[PDB]
Design an enzyme around this catalytic site. Structure first.
Site, mmCIF file in Angstrom:
data_model
loop_
_atom_site.group_PDB
_atom_site.id
_atom_site.type_symbol
_atom_site.label_atom_id
_atom_site.label_comp_id
_atom_site.label_asym_id
_atom_site.label_seq_id
_atom_site.Cartn_x
_atom_site.Cartn_y
_atom_site.Cartn_z
ATOM 1 N N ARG F 54 0.820 -1.201 0.000
ATOM 2 C CA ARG F 54 0.000 0.000 0.000
ATOM 3 C C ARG F 54 0.861 1.261 0.000
ATOM 4 N NH1 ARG F 54 -0.167 4.453 3.451
ATOM 5 N NH2 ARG F 54 -2.151 5.578 3.210
ATOM 6 N N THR F 55 1.744 1.378 0.986
ATOM 7 C CA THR F 55 2.618 2.538 1.099
ATOM 8 C C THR F 55 3.560 2.689 -0.094
ATOM 9 O OG1 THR F 55 2.541 2.779 3.518
ATOM 10 C CG2 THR F 55 4.567 3.512 2.444
ATOM 11 N N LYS F 84 23.883 -11.403 4.327
ATOM 12 C CA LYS F 84 24.480 -10.807 5.517
ATOM 13 C C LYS F 84 25.969 -10.470 5.434
ATOM 14 C CE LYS F 84 23.633 -11.740 10.346
ATOM 15 N NZ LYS F 84 22.490 -12.016 11.254
ATOM 16 N N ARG F 105 11.988 2.166 3.324
ATOM 17 C CA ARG F 105 11.284 1.595 4.457
ATOM 18 C C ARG F 105 12.184 0.448 4.934
ATOM 19 N NH1 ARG F 105 5.516 0.080 6.780
ATOM 20 N NH2 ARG F 105 5.382 2.365 6.506
ATOM 21 N N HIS F 134 6.891 7.616 10.990
ATOM 22 C CA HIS F 134 6.433 7.448 9.618
ATOM 23 C C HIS F 134 5.940 8.786 9.059
ATOM 24 C CE1 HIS F 134 4.912 5.722 6.070
ATOM 25 N NE2 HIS F 134 4.024 4.900 6.566
HETATM 26 N N1 LIG Z 1 3.441 -3.649 6.284
HETATM 27 C C1 LIG Z 1 2.906 -2.430 6.257
HETATM 28 O O1 LIG Z 1 3.500 -1.522 6.899
HETATM 29 N N2 LIG Z 1 1.766 -2.143 5.574
HETATM 30 C C2 LIG Z 1 0.970 -3.088 4.791
HETATM 31 C C3 LIG Z 1 -0.310 -3.477 5.483
HETATM 32 C C4 LIG Z 1 -0.269 -4.798 6.211
HETATM 33 O O2 LIG Z 1 0.427 -4.881 7.287
HETATM 34 O O3 LIG Z 1 -0.914 -5.810 5.758
HETATM 35 C C5 LIG Z 1 0.557 -2.415 3.451
HETATM 36 O O4 LIG Z 1 0.097 -3.120 2.504
HETATM 37 O O5 LIG Z 1 0.666 -1.173 3.282
#
Ligand SMILES: NC(=O)N[C@@H](CC(=O)O)C(=O)O
Ligand SMILES: NC(=O)N[C@@H](CC(=O)O)C(=O)O
Ligand SMILES: NC(=O)N[C@@H](CC(=O)O)C(=O)O
Ligand SMILES: NC(=O)N[C@@H](CC(=O)O)C(=O)O
Ligand SMILES: [Zn+2]
Ligand SMILES: [Zn+2]
Lengths: 153, 310, 310, 153, 310, 310
Positions: F54-55, F84, F105, F134
């Site tokens: 989504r983000t 690593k 992120r 965020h």
């Molecule tokens: N991992 C996240 O920070 N966001 C996820 C939503 C989710 O946790 O399913 C997303 O799709 O934006």
């Protein structure tokens, strides 16, 4: 001991009667307790006025009687319900629901991780009364909840 | 026929003080005088739908120690039962036609109880359902306290760590509450305090208990130091470490402890008990685990053997 | 030395009516009078290259029940044999120098037969090669029918479900065809009908058989109701559900069944037999599975013990 | 047009009436169509004999009328049902159920892989009559089934 | 505004003959005269909940060929959407506030249709719901036949392979049945025959069709040889290979083919068309795939651009 | 050059009220009059070491809406960086020689800040370090409140759910406390209450706030109903469901809400807001998500473009 029949209420002979039922509790009793699953006659009345203020629900099952445990299994849904028995074409019994110590096959466990959910078993909860709340304990997961949580599925 | 013969052992709460005493006595005797062929021609199923090596090796070792035979699995996608369609009921309905007893661990609460309704005259012992009743765990704890303290009454018990999500401690508190005059000291961060329903129970019986911020306050008067496991997940990595203060035990803290005091811990240990504690006379968690063998042997003996003597 | 002593049991088709009778008789006797030390100092390998918990627990339980010792694995990337280079032959050539017998299940057809050429005087029992010959499965079915019906001849047998990909049914049909006067009723959707080579076989022997759309047609005259497993994969999710009509059993359907009729099912059940059938007197699939223990005990006894009596 | 009544049947004024309902179809109509979910009065009768043989069910909802599409949404369950309308304290309308072209919010898709199951949408099927069978097509997966399969959930 | 402007493209059966013609016409024009800036300042979402590289590359390439911008994913442990609970509805309700168009592929039937109820004026193009309606796939097939044959009426079409589970052929047959005088030849093993409902549809329209066991029978009079994909799963490894006979194409079979005959195949090929076919003039499956670009470019143009000319 | 030109955007707490206003103003202007070529010849890195579809879609869509070019990844077995040894430092030291801006992120706190010390004049935008800062998320919330309420001062704000682990609310509370006269209503279970340090901060500023057990108490006077996400992990499945009471929103609860009241929710919703809420005028969570585009477009414009006008 006569034959004088009325209308605004159907008073046929030989059957158990469930009088005084909170609004929207009648249909639930029907569903939850599988009361229509029979060939015996059934007369139902919903939103019918009676003594106490407001509106109520009425259920009558011809030629069929409920035990003491069954009547109690209505305490959680219809606490002010009246259950008059009927034979001789008249009242031959009467009783009011009293909170049981156990309730089966009707409630669902709020705990999603409880084994009872995907399994072929009957739900079962232990009952306890207390200040502004009824506590129901699951026979399986042994977790305890308020009836206000259990009746919000 | 002993009182526990052919009975299901699912919840510690289903056991009466007499039952506890009966199991505890049998354990001491089997420990003093081993009985290798007691369950000679018996076959017991070790069904670990959920893995737990330590507990599994413990139960299974108990079984062999009594001469019993073992079949089972440590399911974790390592078997073919996981096939989601098939119910636990149907699985028990099958396995119970094969064996003389079922020892099972499962990730879901109520697993063993349900099993009881599908096995048939075949007793089921609850390793543990996730989050509910790990019977033999409390029995070994009790047995260990009784052996080191010589009794289970009028004791000063301290339980430290995560008392909110610690079932071994909820179970042990309730069990010790079936004995008289015990004094409880609960040490834990507010976010993981002992559940209010446990305190209510202790109140109903007039049992003395108090809250403390650190072990230092009580140390001098505790007979049993029950150390709990604190999973980082129940908290934030920053919250953990932060609060992790003094909820961990180091040899330093034991300078004024009582000579008889014993330190216990369900065995997954790290970030709780410093290794410099292992050498003191108070360290007893490895002995504790060691007693699981006798408590579990005792349980199997009572359930599968009509009348066991000394 | 009994006829099956030191023999490999790979395909149900390699067994003569006499062999079947011999295994079936031994099973009843071991069931009536258990013999815990029959295979006392023997070590048997349970090699499940392919997982199958139910069948594994069954075979292994049989082994212990006769006092035998067990070593093995339930390979599923849980072992180090999977190392694709090494051949099954080489693995059997090694394991056969360790044990007295090899019980093996494998995902490939012919696994056990091949094993036979590399083991040496060490007998191999075919749990099952994928898709071919699951011996002990048919033997337990036969044993269960014989016990409940009192015979294996002049019976009315109905088999429902996926008869196209159902090997337990192909195997059972062929076995029952070695007995006289049996009547077969095949109920299944066209897309999963009994293979034409099976019908040809029944014709060669003049055995009566007929096709039916639903269980209702025959119910009144069937002595054995063999329910099969219908995997959704052999079809489309829409095709499944759709056709799944009446190929499932519910208590309703048993209103006019014969008092002796028994319902059987290779145990993976769901979407085939409603739980409301479990309480009727006809339900016998858990008993069926329960008989796997005796049929498999009998097989091990005959193969590893020269002359077994009653 | 006058006042005079009867007991073996409740005949109150103003409301829709559902007469002639196959045995064990009345309670389902109630559930399936959320007909008790109101404050208006409701008189229900189950296992009551009528014009034809075969015990039937009876439903009456005071002060509430059903459209043409709604009545039709009963053909699949109560094909020989009679829906008399009521006002003036008498019959002011009448109609039988005719198999619709659409049936929403009640049937469940037999296809387990259909997207309508875990999602917040109303079920919907196309209707086609044929020899000994009704064909229902899912609005979503577009798979087609017999009503005998769809109604066997 | 063209008839397809701002329209959703979910099912092939939702498109009228005019629609097909309109899409086909546009494709040929874009192919003849590329328009790189047609969708310049547009952003399109390529949501592949279910991976499908070939199809995704094709669609996305189409988007760039028109100047559009692309954002999206191929969800299979590649994203965080899978997290259960969050509905497809909510996902589309969000994404539809970001982009101008949604091209999606999902493993569940009806996913695109449902998306349409939560997108809002934002058009959704159904790549494909698993086993239901792959619109652009049929449009590219039609475009290929029309370009190689010069028309879509009065043609001889042979479809070989898995006609039962082959959704590309169910759709292509229905599309072609919207045109006049086509003759169909269905070649497949009984267990994977063309579904009766397709044949019923053809009978309704009085369209000519016939069944054949092998390609040899028809080869001489076919204009289009549509080769289907035969997954081994729909059968048994033995059943597969066995019947695989002649349902595969080799250069040999093409000795008497009509000069204009073209061989097509949804692209996952192997075990169906021998490489020796690639060099013949009939092989057109790669050209076929090549046409996906124009067919998909055309669909995007018509949907996102009001009035497109030549 | 605007104040945010070439600046890193790591923590919300690093932005002055002027900065917030400046970002908010720009967002409204870009929303009113789109500028598709603003970042034409720029290439931005979308580095999602930790997946967040989504983000990521939101940010990346923003980049294209401005004409910028995009390269990057969602690292979770999708790349070869995880290997690593290779530090985040070195990774940023490389990528920062490729692109003009880095949007990242990461699952670890302080990842973006550290990136700033290795990027070099190349700005880094913190999508989000797991559970810390965020920025764009708070900016889009603020932008939504301002647009629906017309201001960010003198508002009644209710935050419901997991206020203890809900980082979006810790940030939003601090942002809103940079504006005057706001009234806060914190609704949550004791075990997930707003942290004391947030309340201390509010006391320092003399800001009004109060605790409540349910939404019902405040509903009548709230302008913003900020709904939080409640992960089951932060509790016990029984503890969850249990307390889940009334911490969920249903259309019913909205009977006496103020006409202008808006309901917001970081987008992963389910078990918090019943779908029956979606149809009311108060539901604004999808609109909220929609605003991420403008808030994030604005941040990119200000950072990569010296002087942006209306
Ligand atoms: N991992 C996240 O920070 N966001 C996820 C939503 C989710 O946790 O399913 C997303 O799709 O934006
Ligand atoms: N799963 C458990 O309940 N216990 C584990 C220890 C562990 O958690 O790693 C064990 O090995 O006993
Ligand atoms: N693999 C098998 O052949 N059988 C499985 C059942 C299953 O398929 O899940 C078993 O547990 O016996
Ligand atoms: N999954 C699909 O629908 N298509 C795959 C081909 C494949 O199955 O390998 C592709 O790459 O296009
Ligand atoms: Zn429970
Ligand atoms: Zn559907």
């Amino acid at each position: 001991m006569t034959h004088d029949n009325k209308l605004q209420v159907e008073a046929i002979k030989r059957g158990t009667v469930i009088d005084h039922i909170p609004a929207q509790i009648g249909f639930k009793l029907l569903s939850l307790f599988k009361l229509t699953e029979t060939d015996q006659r059934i007369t139902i009345g919903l939103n019918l006025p009676s003594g106490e203020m407001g509106r109520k629900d009425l259920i009558k099952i011809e030629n069929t009687f409920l035990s003491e445990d069954q009547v109690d299994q209505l305490a959680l849904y219809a606490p002010q319900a009246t259950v008059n028995r009927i034979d001789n074409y008249e009242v031959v019994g009467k009783s009011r629901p009293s909170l049981p110590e156990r309730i089966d096959n009707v409630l669902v466990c709020p705990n999603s991780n409880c084994i009872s959910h995907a399994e072929p078993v009957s739900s079962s909860f232990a009952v306890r009364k207390r200040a502004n709340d009824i506590a129901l304990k699951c026979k399986y997961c042994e977790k305890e909840f308020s009836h206000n949580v259990v009746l919000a599925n | 026929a002993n009182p526990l013969y052919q009975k299901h052992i699912i919840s510690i709460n289903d056991l009466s003080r007499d039952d506890l005493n009966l199991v505890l006595a049998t354990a001491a005797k089997l420990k003093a005088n081993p009985q290798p062929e007691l369950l000679k021609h018996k076959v017991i199923a070790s069904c670990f739908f959920e893995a737990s090596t330590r507990t599994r090796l413990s139960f299974e070792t108990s079984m062999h120690r009594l001469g019993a035979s073992v079949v089972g699995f440590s399911d974790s996608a390592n078997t073919s039962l996981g096939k989601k369609g098939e119910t636990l009921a149907d699985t028990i309905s099958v396995i119970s036609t094969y064996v003389d007893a079922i020892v099972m661990r499962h990730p879901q609460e109520g697993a063993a109880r349900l099993a009881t309704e599908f096995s048939g005259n075949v007793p089921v012992l609850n390793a543990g359902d996730g989050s509910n009743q790990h019977p033999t765990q409390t029995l070994l704890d009790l047995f260990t306290i009784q052996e080191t303290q010589g009794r289970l009454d009028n004791l000063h018990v301290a339980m430290v760590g995560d008392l909110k999500y610690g079932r071994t401690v909820h179970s042990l508190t309730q069990a010790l509450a079936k004995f008289d005059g015990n004094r409880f000291y609960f040490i834990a961060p507010d976010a993981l305090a002992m559940p209010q329903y446990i305190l209510d129970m202790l109140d109903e019986k007039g049992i003395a208990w108090s809250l403390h911020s650190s072990i230092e306050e009580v140390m001098a008067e505790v007979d049993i130091l029950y150390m709990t496991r604190v999973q980082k997940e129940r908290l934030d990595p920053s919250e953990y470490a932060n609060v992790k203060a003094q909820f961990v035990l180091r040899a330093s803290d034991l300078h004024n402890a009582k000579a008889n005091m014993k330190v216990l811990h369900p065995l997954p240990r790290v970030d709780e008990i410093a290794t410099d504690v292992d050498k003191t006379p108070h360290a007893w968690y490895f002995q504790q685990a060691g007693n699981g063998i006798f408590a579990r042997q005792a349980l199997l003996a009572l359930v599968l053997n009509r009348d066991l003597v000394l």
